[PDB]
């Protein structure tokens, strides 16, 4: 529920009607398929909050 946006170097996800940038995570987003199908895709990290909790 949002749009991907960049300030010039970082990538964020925002609600559409008001600028409120969030870090991109596996909860702000969902998967469908491989990179090759989509016209105009971009490359970035998607953060996973479980990985530090399993590392600790």
């Amino acid at each position: 529920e949002g749009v991907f946006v960049s300030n010039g170097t970082h990538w964020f996800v925002t609600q559409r009607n008001f600028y409120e940038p969030q870090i991109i995570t596996t909860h702000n987003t969902f998967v469908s398929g491989n990179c090759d199908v989509v016209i105009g895709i971009v490359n970035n990290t998607v953060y996973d909050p479980l990985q530090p909790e399993l590392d600790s």
């Binding site: 749009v3 559409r16 969902f30 469908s32 398929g33 199908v37 989509v38 016209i39 105009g40």
Partner: protein, 50 residues
């Protein structure tokens, strides 16, 4: 406020309860179906006044 037309169409899909990836994974088919349907309006309006 400007927005890319394919991203605008992904939110018009999302507004009818069809998930956004259903547009981006089918974008050439959806574009060809629209372009084809506008061609049928042009032909129908040229064909009859009724």
């Amino acid at each position: 406020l400007q927005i890319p037309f394919a991203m605008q169409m992904a939110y018009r899909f999302n507004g009818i309860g069809v998930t956004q990836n259903v547009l981006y994974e089918n974008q050439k088919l959806i574009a060809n179906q629209f372009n084809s349907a506008i061609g049928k309006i042009q032909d129908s309006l040229s064909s009859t006044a009724s």
